[PDB]
Amino acid sequence: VRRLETIVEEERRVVVQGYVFDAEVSELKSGRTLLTMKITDYTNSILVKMFSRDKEDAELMSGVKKGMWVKVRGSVQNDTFVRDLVIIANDLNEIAANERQDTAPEGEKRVELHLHTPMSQMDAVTSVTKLIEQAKKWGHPAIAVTDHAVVQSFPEAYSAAKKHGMKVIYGLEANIVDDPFHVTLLAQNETGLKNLFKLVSLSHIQYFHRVPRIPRSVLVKHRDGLLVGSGCDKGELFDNVEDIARFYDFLEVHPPDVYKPLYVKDEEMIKNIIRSIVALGEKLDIPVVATGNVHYLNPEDKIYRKILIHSQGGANPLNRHELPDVYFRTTNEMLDCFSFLGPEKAKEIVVDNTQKIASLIGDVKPIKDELYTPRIEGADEEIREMSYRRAKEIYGDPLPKLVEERLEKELKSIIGHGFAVIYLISHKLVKKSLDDGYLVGSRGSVGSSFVATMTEITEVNPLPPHYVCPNCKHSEFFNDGSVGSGFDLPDKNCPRCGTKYKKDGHDIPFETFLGFKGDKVPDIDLNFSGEYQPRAHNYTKVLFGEDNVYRAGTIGTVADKTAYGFVKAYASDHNLELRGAEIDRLAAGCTGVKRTTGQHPGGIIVVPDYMEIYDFTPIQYPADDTSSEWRTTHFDFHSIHDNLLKLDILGHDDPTVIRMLQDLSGIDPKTIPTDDPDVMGIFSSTEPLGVTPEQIMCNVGTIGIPEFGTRFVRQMLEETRPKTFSELVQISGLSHGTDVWLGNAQELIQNGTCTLSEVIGCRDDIMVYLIYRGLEPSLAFKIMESVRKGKGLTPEFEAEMRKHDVPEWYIDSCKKIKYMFPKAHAAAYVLMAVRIAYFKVHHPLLYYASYFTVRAEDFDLDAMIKGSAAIRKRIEEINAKGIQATAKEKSLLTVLEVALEMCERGFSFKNIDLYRSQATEFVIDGNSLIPPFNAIPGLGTNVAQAIVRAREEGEFLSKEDLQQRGKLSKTLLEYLESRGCLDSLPDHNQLSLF
DNA sequence: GAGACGGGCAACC
DNA sequence: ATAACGGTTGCCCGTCTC
Numbered sequence A: 001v002r003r004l005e006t007i008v009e010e011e012r013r014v015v016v017q018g019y020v021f022d023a024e025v026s027e028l029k030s031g032r033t034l035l036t037m038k039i040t041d042y043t044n045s046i047l048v049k050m051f052s053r054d055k056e057d058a059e060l061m062s063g064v065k066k067g068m069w070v071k072v073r074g075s076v077q078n079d080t081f082v083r084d085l086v087i088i089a090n091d092l093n094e095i096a097a098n099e100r101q102d103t104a105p106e107g108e109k110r111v112e113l114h115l116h117t118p119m120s121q122m123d124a125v126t127s128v129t130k131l132i133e134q135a136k137k138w139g140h141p142a143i144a145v146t147d148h149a150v151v152q153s154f155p156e157a158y159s160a161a162k163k164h165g166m167k168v169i170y171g172l173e174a175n176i177v178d179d180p181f182h183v184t185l186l187a188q189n190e191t192g193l194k195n196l197f198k199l200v201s202l203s204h205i206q207y208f209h210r211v212p213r214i215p216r217s218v219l220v221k222h223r224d225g226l227l228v229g230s231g232c233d234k235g236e237l238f239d240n241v242e243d244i245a246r247f248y249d250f251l252e253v254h255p256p257d258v259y260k261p262l263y264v265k266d267e268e269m270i271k272n273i274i275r276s277i278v279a280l281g282e283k284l285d286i287p288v289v290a291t292g293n294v295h296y297l298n299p300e301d302k303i304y305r306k307i308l309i310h311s312q313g314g315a316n317p318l319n320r321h322e323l324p325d326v327y328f329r330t331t332n333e334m335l336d337c338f339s340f341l342g343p344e345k346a347k348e349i350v351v352d353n354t355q356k357i358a359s360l361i362g363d364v365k366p367i368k369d370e371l372y373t374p375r376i377e378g379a380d381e382e383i384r385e386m387s388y389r390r391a392k393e394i395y396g397d398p399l400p401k402l403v404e405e406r407l408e409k410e411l412k413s414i415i416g417h418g419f420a421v422i423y424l425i426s427h428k429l430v431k432k433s434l435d436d437g438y439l440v441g442s443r444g445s446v447g448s449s450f451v452a453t454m455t456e457i458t459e460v461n462p463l464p465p466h467y468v469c470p471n472c473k474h475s476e477f478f479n480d481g482s483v484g485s486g487f488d489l490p491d492k493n494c495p496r497c498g499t500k501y502k503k504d505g506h507d508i509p510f511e512t513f514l515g516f517k518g519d520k521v522p523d524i525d526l527n528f529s530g531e532y533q534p535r536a537h538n539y540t541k542v543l544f545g546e547d548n549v550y551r552a553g554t555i556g557t558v559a560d561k562t563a564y565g566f567v568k569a570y571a572s573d574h575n576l577e578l579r580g581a582e583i584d585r586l587a588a589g590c591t592g593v594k595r596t597t598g599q600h601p602g603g604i605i606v607v608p609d610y611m612e613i614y615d616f617t618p619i620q621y622p623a624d625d626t627s628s629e630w631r632t633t634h635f636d637f638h639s640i641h642d643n644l645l646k647l648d649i650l651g652h653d654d655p656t657v658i659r660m661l662q663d664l665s666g667i668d669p670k671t672i673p674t675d676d677p678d679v680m681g682i683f684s685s686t687e688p689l690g691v692t693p694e695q696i697m698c699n700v701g702t703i704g705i706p707e708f709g710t711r712f713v714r715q716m717l718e719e720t721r722p723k724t725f726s727e728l729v730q731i732s733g734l735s736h737g738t739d740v741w742l743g744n745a746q747e748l749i750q751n752g753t754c755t756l757s758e759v760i761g762c763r764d765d766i767m768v769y770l771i772y773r774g775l776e777p778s779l780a781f782k783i784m785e786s787v788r789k790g791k792g793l794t795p796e797f798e799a800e801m802r803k804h805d806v807p808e809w810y811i812d813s814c815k816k817i818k819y820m821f822p823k824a825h826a827a828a829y830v831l832m833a834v835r836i837a838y839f840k841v842h843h844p845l846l847y848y849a850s851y852f853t854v855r856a857e858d859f860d861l862d863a864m865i866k867g868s869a870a871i872r873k874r875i876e877e878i879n880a881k882g883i884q885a886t887a888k889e890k891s892l893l894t895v896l897e898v899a900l901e902m903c904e905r906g907f908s909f910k911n912i913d914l915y916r917s918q919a920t921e922f923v924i925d926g927n928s929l930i931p932p933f934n935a936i937p938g939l940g941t942n943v944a945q946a947i948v949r950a951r952e953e954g955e956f957l958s959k960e961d962l963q964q965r966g967k968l969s970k971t972l973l974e975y976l977e978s979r980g981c982l983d984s985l986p987d988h989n990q991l992s993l994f
Numbered sequence B: 001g002a003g004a005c006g007g008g009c010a011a012c013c
Numbered sequence C: 001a002t003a004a005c006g007g008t009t010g011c012c013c014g015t016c017t018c
C-alpha cells in the first residue's frame, strides 16, 4: 500500500488509498462507462480512471461520491490528454475513513479551550463546523471558539452547535496593551457575550492602532461574564511574577511540541517552564489547563496554512521559521504529551480542569431568534393616511371595492408585522432624491405591494390590469386573467368624461412580499443613481439618528481563483512540479479562509431605539479604515437576516441613464408609452433602427438595452419574439437565473409540453398556480420561496403537488430553477428598459451619448474614430477568442458592439479635442460624439477634471502650459500629441509673465 | 514612497 | 461558434510616473 507522494513514474502495478474529493461518470461510444475520480491520501493526490466491463460495475461507478474513502489497485500511466501520470484502476473498494479515534473513557474526556477557525485572518484552515463535529465524535463535552481579535465564526458555530448537539464556548483571543500581548476570553453568559461584542467593537474603532487592541483597563471595565486566560507564548506571563498571574481565572500551557520555535536552550527548558506554571497555578489555587491552540483538524492539514502564510512575503514574519504542530489533539494523545508531569497532573490539567472551566460556562445564544422592529411616532397612522389619500385621488371616493380591500388587507399586515416605519423612511428617501434632481428606479419584491405604490416607493402598480381616468377617476378592471398587464391594453377613452384613459396593473399578489403568516422578513429595495447613492445613505443617519443605522459589513474570503493563485506561487517558489489533481486539492483546502473585510453594496441595517447594536453584533470599520464615514456590522447581513430590518439602498446606472436622457431631450420619461410599436419592435427586430442584421452583426435591436442587450438574451429574443409589455416581463424572468431557460423552460416549449406563457417565468406564478390547483396558500408560498432560492422541493412539497394534480413536468421544472425574480422586479426593470428603448429609437445620439457617458468604461478610441470597419475588425478579434476571452475583453466587446451600431445608424466619433472635449461626458456635436478626456487610457476622472478646470481659467498657451496646468504625465501628453491634438500649439512659450 | 489608475477578484442584489 | 443570468459596489495590489 503506497503513499501517493511515492508515486513518481509509470509503473505496472500499485495499491493506493484516499479520499475522493471529486468523481464524475461518463459514457463511451462503445457502451462502456468511464469513472473519473481525484483522490488524496493527504501526502499527495492523483487522478484515477476506471473503465466498466459490465453494466453492474457501471452503475456502482455512479455510486462513488465525494466524501468516500477508497482503496484502488491499478497501473500508473502517463495520460497525454491530462499531461500527468494517472492510475488506471482494475480494482476499487470503499473503505472506512478510520480517522483519529479518542480512546479515553466516556465521562473522562478533554475540552479544548483555545481554538482558531478560518475567520482568524489567513491563519487557520478547518471550518468551525468540522471542528465541532470532530469534538462531538470524540465525545468532548464542549469546545471553545477563540479566534484572533474577532468573533466572526460565532453564527456558524451556533448553527453547528444546534445541528450537532454540541456545547460551544464563545470566546476571543484578544490583544491587550497596558495602560502588546494575547489573552483568552471565554463568555460565561449573555453579559459576557455582550461584553465580547463591545470589546471587539472598541478594539476596532476607538483603540485600533495598526491592529485591533484592548487597553487592560478597558478589559476590566468589560470583564463581567468573561473567564480570562493567560495562554500563548505571546502571553503576558509565559514571556518571563505572581501578580501578573493572579489576574487570570485560568493558566494556559501548550503541548511541549507547540513551543518548538526556539529564546530557549532545549526541550528540557520548555518542559520545565510548563512546570513552573504548573507550580504557580497550584500555589495560587488557579486552574492550570492544557490547551492546544488549534489552527486545523489534522496533523497533515498543516500544509494549507503554510501555503496561506507564505503568500504574505516578509510582511508576515512567521515565515521566519517552521510552523508548530497545532492540530486538534485527542484527550488520550494530550495525556501522552503531558505524561512527564505524571499520571495525576496529566489527568488533572487535561481533563478535570479543562472540564471544570467548561462547567463554569452557561448556555449562550450568540444570535437572536426574533425580528426587532423600529418605532417612530406617527408612522403606522401616517402610512395609512398617505396610502388612502393618494389612492382616492387616483381611484376616487369612495374607492372601488377592489382597491378598498387591497388597502385594508395590505395595511394591517405591514403595520402588524412592524414594517410601517421603513415604508415611510423609504418614502422620504425617494422624495429627497427627486427633490435633489435624481429619479429613483424600482426594484425587488416591494413592487408586490399596492400600499408601496401609493406611498411612492415603487412605480409598479400590482393591482389587476385596468383603465383609470386621470380626470374623472372612473375605472375598469379585468379579472378575466385573460390580460397580463394593463400596459398591454389598447388606448381607450373614458366613456364618461371623454378623456384619454391611463393604463396600469400587473396583477401581483401582495404575499410575494410578506407571505401569509408575516413570518418572513423582506427588505425594501431601491435603485438610486450611483452618483447619488452616498447621499441617500447619509439621509438615513438624519432620519434614524447616527447610532441607529449601520452599513452592513462583509467578510472577504479566499475563493477558487485566489486559492489556485496562492498554490501555484507556493509551488513555483519551492520548485515543486505538482500534478493537476494535487494542485486542485491544495486549492480546495485554502478556500473559505478570511482575508479581508468590506462593505455590503448598499444595505443599511436599522436598529430599533429600544435595543442596541450590541444586542445583535459588534461593529467596526470596513477594511479597518479609521477615516470611513460609516461603521460596519462585524457579522454580515446574512447572519442577522432575521433580526433587524434592512434598507437596500443600491446604486445602479439605469436611473442615471434615463436622468441624462431627460436632462437632454426635456422629455418627461413618465410620459413615454409602453406599447409604441417601433420601440417594442426592437425586442424582436433591427427594422426600427434603420439598419440590417448584417450591418450590426445582430438579429434583434436590443444592443445596449439593460439586461436584454446581452448575447444570451438576444438569442432568447430571437426565438421568443416578444411584442408586449407582459411578454417582455415573462422573458425578463426567464433570462435571469441558472437552469430557468436552458435545459428547462426552453425544452418544455420546444417539446410542446407547454406554451411560452405557461412556462415558469416569475416566482409569483408558482404560488398563484399552486393555490389555483387547490394547495393551502401559505404552503404554496413556502414552495414558491424554496424554488426561487434554488432549494428545490422536499418530499412533502412534491406529495402536496401530486395530490392536487400538479403534473410531473411542472414539479420537475421547479426542481431545476436555481434562482428566480419576483414579477414586480421584472416589471420594474422592463419599464426602465422600455423608457430607454424609446430614446434608442427616436433620439439615437442622445441614447449613445448617455450610453458611453454612464455605462462604458472600456474603449478602443482609435478603432471607434476610424469607424465602422475598424470597430468590426476589433470585435472579430475578440469574437475569435471565444470564451477564452478575459472579463476585460468582454467589457470592451460589449461597448464596441454599441459603437458599431452607432456608426451604421449614420453617426460617428471625433478625436479628443482640446477645447470641446469634456471631463467625463460624451458630448453631442452635429452627428458625432466628442469623447471626453477620461476615455483616454491612463487618464482618470481627476486629471480629466483638472484639464477642464485649467482651460476654463485660461486657454493653454503651449504644450508645456497644458502639461503643467493640466497635470499631465509625459505619456498622456504624447497620447494627445501623436493624434494631432496639440498641433495648433507651440511646444513652449518664449515669454512668461505673472 | 506617495499616489492615481486599472485589472482581478469577492460579495451581494 | 459553443453555452450562456445581469448588474452593481467595494478592497487589494502591481505598475507606471514624478
Ligand SMILES: Nc1nc2c(ncn2[C@H]2C[C@H](O)[C@@H](COP(=O)(O)OP(=O)(O)OP(=O)(O)O)O2)c(=O)[nH]1
Pocket (backbone or CB within 6 Å): A443, A444, A445, A446, A512, A513, A521, A522, A523, A524, A525, A648, A736, A737, A819, A821, A822, A825, B013, C005, C006
Ligand atoms: N439578475 C439577478 N437579480 C437579482 C439577484 N438577486 C436579487 N436580484 C434583484 C432581483 C430581486 O428582486 C432584487 C433582489 O432583492 P432582494 O435580495 O431584496 O430579494 P427580493 O426583493 O427579490 O425578495 P425579498 O422579499 O427581499 O426577500 O434584486 C440575482 O441573483 N440575479
Ligand SMILES: [Mg+2]
Pocket (backbone or CB within 6 Å): A173, A182, A232, A233, A234
Ligand atoms: Mg496566541
Ligand SMILES: [Mg+2]
Pocket (backbone or CB within 6 Å): A114, A115, A116, A173, A232, A293
Ligand atoms: Mg492562539
Ligand SMILES: [Mg+2]
Pocket (backbone or CB within 6 Å): A444, A445, A446, A522, A523, A524, A525
Ligand atoms: Mg428585496
Ligand SMILES: [Zn+2]
Pocket (backbone or CB within 6 Å): A469, A471, A472, A473, A474, A494, A495, A496, A497, A498, A499
Ligand atoms: Zn373620465
